Design a protein around this ligand. Structure first.
Ligand code: HEC
Length: 104
């Protein structure tokens, strides 16, 4: 719950292939705008994978955590293989930033 350390983990983790900035520009990957609430593979832009287009679950706070600790195992098929998170606060914090970052 530290948008501060959450941002740090973001600039070095997700900023790589993301934007998480409203009215931004999805680069080397889709955006996470108003993510918390939309169904998997629902963002119009990047060619989402069938697994994400399967619409099995919806992005949320906790859902993102399990997804942040194993993005692949959560929705097998999703195009994203880099590195999951280690500690919980890393996910919560990281998610705290993804919230205020995808809200602005
Ligand atoms: C490039 C090596 C990536 C890094 C680093 C991160 N992500 Fe990513 N992410 C990437 C791709 C190519 C995709 C598309 C996969 C697909 O099925 O279309 C994604 C997707 C996501 C999503 C899902 C989008 C949605 O369904 O709304 C999320 C929530 C996401 N990525 C989060 C995320 C976070 C928090 C990262 C930093 C820890 C991160 N990604 C890094 C590619 C890459």
């Amino acid at each position: 719950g530290d948008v501060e350390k959450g941002k740090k983990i973001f600039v070095q983790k997700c900023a790589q292939c993301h934007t998480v900035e409203k009215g931004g520009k999805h680069k080397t990957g889709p955006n996470l705008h108003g993510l918390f609430g939309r169904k998997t593979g629902q963002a119009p832009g990047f060619t989402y994978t069938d697994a994400n287009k399967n619409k099995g679950i919806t992005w949320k706070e906790e859902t993102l955590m399990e997804y942040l600790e194993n993005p692949k195992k959560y929705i097998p098929g999703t195009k994203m293989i880099f590195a999951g998170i280690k500690k919980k606060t890393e996910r919560e914090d990281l998610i705290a930033y993804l919230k205020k970052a995808t809200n602005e």
